[PDB]
Amino acid sequence: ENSLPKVSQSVYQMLLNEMVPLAMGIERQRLKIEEHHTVDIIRSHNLIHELYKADEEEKEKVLARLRNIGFQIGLKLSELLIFSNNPNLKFKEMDLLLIMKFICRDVWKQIFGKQIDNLKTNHRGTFYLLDYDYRPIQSFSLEEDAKNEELKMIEPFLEIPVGIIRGVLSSLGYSSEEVICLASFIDRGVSFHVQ
Amino acid sequence: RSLKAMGEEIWKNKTEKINTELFTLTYGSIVAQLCQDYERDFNKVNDHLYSMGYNIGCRLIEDFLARTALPRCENLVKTSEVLSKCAFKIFLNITPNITNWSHNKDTFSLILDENPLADFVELPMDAMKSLWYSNILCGVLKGSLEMVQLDCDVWFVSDILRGDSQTEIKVKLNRILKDEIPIG
Amino acid sequence: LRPCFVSLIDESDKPILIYVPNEAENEMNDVLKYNVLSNISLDYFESALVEWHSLDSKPLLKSIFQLEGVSVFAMLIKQTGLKIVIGFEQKSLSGADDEFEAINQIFETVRKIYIRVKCNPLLVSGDEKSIIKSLERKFDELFISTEVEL
Amino acid sequence: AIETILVINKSGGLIYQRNFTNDEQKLNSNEYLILASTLHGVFAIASQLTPKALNTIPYIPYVGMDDFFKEPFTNWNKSGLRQLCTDQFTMFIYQTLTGLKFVAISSSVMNLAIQIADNFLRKVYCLYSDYVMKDPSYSMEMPIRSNLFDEKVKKMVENLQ
Amino acid sequence: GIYSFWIFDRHCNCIFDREWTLASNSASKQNEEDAKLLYGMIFSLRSITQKLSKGSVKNDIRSISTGKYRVHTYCTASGLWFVLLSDFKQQSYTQVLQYIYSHIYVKYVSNNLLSPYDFAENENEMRGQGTRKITNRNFISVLESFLAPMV
């Protein structure tokens, strides 16, 4: 239908990469940059992500700050989805844990583009969604000596869509939990699991 | 004018669309994360929002040159206008205008029409002083420009909320030193 | 097409997990029958001259049994001493050979799931608690929860 | 297409320069000598890259309407710089067996493209070695002050384009 | 025929690894000295065409076309110099080098946040005698995927 406002996916996507060394720099707080007013020391983004899992600090307090930031995103976009477009499926108050399949059929296409899911739910008690090529970190690289050492590193990046889909259920009002695995498809991987 | 039309051609070349209001909430959310995490120190979030901007703009500028095969500018006067239209317009669908163009050609200012960091934003009276909202824009401009071998400093001086006046960034050129000692 | 339990025993005759699907949300206390069926098959490893194994190349689907409402068997790979067994409810049982090789191949799928979760070093020293919950969390979608995929 | 011709002596120094048809200048003499010394320094190292890690002849199109020798000849320059191309000009190099390097720089673009600008440059090396080689004012490895040389190569710029 | 690919930054460093895509001459490091003398041939000839400039613009170098091979360069405006040594069968790769900048480089280097700008080792020997940086599982593999059509 209506298609008025547009901004790039790219600068968006690097911002979605860049909430995590932001949070590491929050916890850890010379290139004298703003020398009209002040000075900075440095900010090693290549070593900030090589300080959480490549040095094994107390990131467990910091992981809540990755969890926290998606909630206020996840609370306040359901109303913004009907200002995104108005496709008449947009109403919210008919279903409880059975339009989370379909609110993550759209906002997961509107912050991640694709819709390859293969959803599975045990007796409509717990619903889980998985995809084979996650849009941030399947553009990401390695140090080529192994691969399993690199899957230590990427574990804080998975926690940003914790807060999103937990935000929408708390937008409907909930206290049901959520945990993230990392799958491995066999054809040319990460899974999600909510109660 | 070709560099007029480059932004519209790239806006038909690239196909990447987010709705603009979704970008604003993901900027208001992260500055709210700094606001509630740190101890309401609006001074002390401009610096680290700038640190965000520096360390994301110095990875931003080479994909900007990837889409826009442009030569390295050497004066102020052409990079000011191409930063005022193309390097924003392929990313942020805006065209900020250069005004107050100084006679010594070392400084200027930049009115921007609208911004998608500050579309529908209200700040509280605690936040109403001692804070500039788009210090990530200071970061991305300064950390962008020190890749291309000119250590300009820009600093954003007036919100459309702070003072409710106008949106300006005071800019100052500095040296144009290139790299050296290939002998080692 | 649906197992009635899933049982796992290592080489020291210690049961790793006698998993039963749907003991919450549905009928309880038949799990008390299920684990003692597993122990009947555990001391019924080889008894009264009945031999299950003759092929040493790949351990295929071995001898079917049927006892008091279920249909159990065994699949001893003989690799790292794994002794895992699966029963089926005799109520919904068609008794064909593509059924027989079908439960042979899904026995090898649950073999694959155990050998995948056996060497996941994303969490190390996962040997006593929530390794069990994690492998149950990988069990409970391969035979059920297909209801919403379409 | 060619607008400036240099010649280089074998000891790494400029000999002659004429900015023929460009007719707006910013370069005086010793910056052209800086170019001559740096192309001699480049042509020093521009053989031993040996990127292989391990008979080619030029040809006869009759450039310059007779010619001197109507035959596909050889060339001594089996390893080194031959030509360059940029977005505002292109440049050419021809060496002798003795050691003279024979620059030609062309503003437009003019395989075959090396070969026409090789076939030009055997002619001027013939014309160098008949019109200022036989000259008693010409002491050795000095500049060229024969005006008789200079219009007779100025005629051959318009005998090219 | 393509002999060798190399990657050249602003700080006069090569970041090309074990030689292949026919840089081993067997798919039709010892060359760390060769990185310097390739740089000296280009940078000196960068200054030649810089000193002859017409019409309010600088000049990029397309190709030094030597004897018995070629060399094709692509100097960026960021000081990145993608250099490729052909065998004079095809013409200048001034869009193949744009493909391996806009697609295989910037989407696989400098978007990956576990690898830096490869600038310096927190130290002031960027201008020489530094061990290289580019070792990726994906990038080296997808480069070799792209260039095995050529050689």
From Swiss-Prot, chain B:
Pfam family, one: TRAPP
Transport is among the record's keywords: yes
GO BP terms in the entry: cellular response to nitrogen starvation; cytoplasm to vacuole targeting by the Cvt pathway; endoplasmic reticulum to Golgi vesicle-mediated transport; intra-Golgi vesicle-mediated transport; macroautophagy; retrograde transport, endosome to Golgi
Name used for this protein in its record: Trafficking protein particle complex subunit BET3
Subcellular location: Golgi apparatus, cis-Golgi network; Endoplasmic reticulum; Preautophagosomal structure
Single GO cellular component term: TRAPPIII protein complex
Protein family membership: Belongs to the TRAPP small subunits family. BET3 subfamily.
Lipid-carrying residues in chain (S-palmitoyl cysteine): C73
Role played: Component of the TRAPP I, TRAPP II and TRAPP III complexes which act as guanine nucleotide exchange factors (GEF) for YPT1. TRAPP I plays a key role in the late stages of endoplasmic reticulum to Golgi traffic. TRAPP II plays a role in intra-Golgi transport. TRAPP III plays a role in autophagosome formation. Required for sporulation. Has a role late in meiosis following DNA replication.
Other known facts: Present with 2370 molecules/cell in log phase SD medium.
From Swiss-Prot, chain C:
Pfam families per UniProt: Sedlin_N (PF04628)
Protein location: Golgi apparatus, trans-Golgi network
Keywords assigned by UniProt, alphabetized: Golgi apparatus
Keyword Magnesium: no
Domain of life (superkingdom): Eukaryota
Disulfide bonds: none
CC per GO annotation: cytoplasm; cytosol; Golgi apparatus; nucleus; TRAPP complex; TRAPPII protein complex
Keyword presence, Lipid metabolism: no
Alphabetical GO biological process terms: early endosome to Golgi transport; endoplasmic reticulum to Golgi vesicle-mediated transport; intra-Golgi vesicle-mediated transport; protein-containing complex assembly; retrograde transport, endosome to Golgi
InterPro entries for this protein: Longin-like_dom_sf, Sedlin
Family: Belongs to the TRAPP small subunits family. Sedlin subfamily.
Function: Required, together with the TRAPP II subunit TRS33, for TRAPP II complex assembly or stability, and for proper Golgi localization of TRAPP and the Rab GTPase YPT31.
Note: Present with 8660 molecules/cell in log phase SD medium.
Subunit structure: Interacts with the TRAPP II complex; TRAPP II subunits TRS33 and TRS65 are required for this interaction.
The name this protein goes by in its record: TRAPP-associated protein TCA17
Source species of the chain: Saccharomyces cerevisiae (strain ATCC 204508 / S288c)
Gene that this sequence comes from: TCA17
From Swiss-Prot, chain D:
Intrachain S-S bonds: none
InterPro entries, A to Z: Longin-like_dom_sf, TRAPPC
Localization: Golgi apparatus, cis-Golgi network; Endoplasmic reticulum; Preautophagosomal structure
Signal peptide: none
Major localisation: Golgi
GO cellular component, one term: TRAPP complex
Entry keyword Metal-binding: no
GO BP terms: chromosome organization; endoplasmic reticulum to Golgi vesicle-mediated transport; intra-Golgi vesicle-mediated transport; macroautophagy; retrograde transport, endosome to Golgi
Pfam families: Sybindin
Keywords: Autophagy, Endoplasmic reticulum, ER-Golgi transport, Golgi apparatus, Transport
Top-level taxon: Eukaryota
Similarity remark: Belongs to the TRAPP small subunits family. TRAPPC4 subfamily.
Complex and partners: Part of the multisubunit TRAPP (transport protein particle) I complex composed of BET3, BET5, TRS20, TRS23, TRS31 and TRS33. Part of the multisubunit TRAPP (transport protein particle) II complex composed of BET3, BET5, TRS20, TRS23, TRS31, TRS33, TRS65, TRS85, TRS120 and TRS130. Part of the multisubunit TRAPP (transport protein particle) III complex composed of BET3, BET5, TRS20, TRS23, TRS31, TRS33 and TRS85.
Additional observations: Present with 3130 molecules/cell in log phase SD medium.
Protein name per UniProt: Trafficking protein particle complex subunit 23
Curated annotation (Swiss-Prot), chain E:
SMART domains assigned to the protein according to its UniProt record, in alphabetical order: Sybindin
Subcellular compartments: Golgi apparatus, cis-Golgi network; Endoplasmic reticulum; Preautophagosomal structure
Function noted in UniProt: Component of the TRAPP I, TRAPP II and TRAPP III complexes which act as guanine nucleotide exchange factors (GEF) for YPT1. TRAPP I plays a key role in the late stages of endoplasmic reticulum to Golgi traffic. TRAPP II plays a role in intra-Golgi transport. TRAPP III plays a role in autophagosome formation. Required for sporulation. Has a role late in meiosis following DNA replication.
Gene (UniProt): BET5
Subunit structure: Part of the multisubunit TRAPP (transport protein particle) I complex composed of BET3, BET5, TRS20, TRS23, TRS31 and TRS33. Part of the multisubunit TRAPP (transport protein particle) II complex composed of BET3, BET5, TRS20, TRS23, TRS31, TRS33, TRS65, TRS85, TRS120 and TRS130. Part of the multisubunit TRAPP (transport protein particle) III complex composed of BET3, BET5, TRS20, TRS23, TRS31, TRS33 and TRS85.
Protein name: Trafficking protein particle complex subunit BET5
Keywords: Autophagy, Endoplasmic reticulum, ER-Golgi transport, Golgi apparatus, Transport
Organism: Saccharomyces cerevisiae (strain ATCC 204508 / S288c)
Keyword field contains Endoplasmic reticulum: yes
Gene Ontology process terms (BP): endoplasmic reticulum to Golgi vesicle-mediated transport; intra-Golgi vesicle-mediated transport; macroautophagy; retrograde transport, endosome to Golgi
Chief location: Golgi
Coiled coil: none
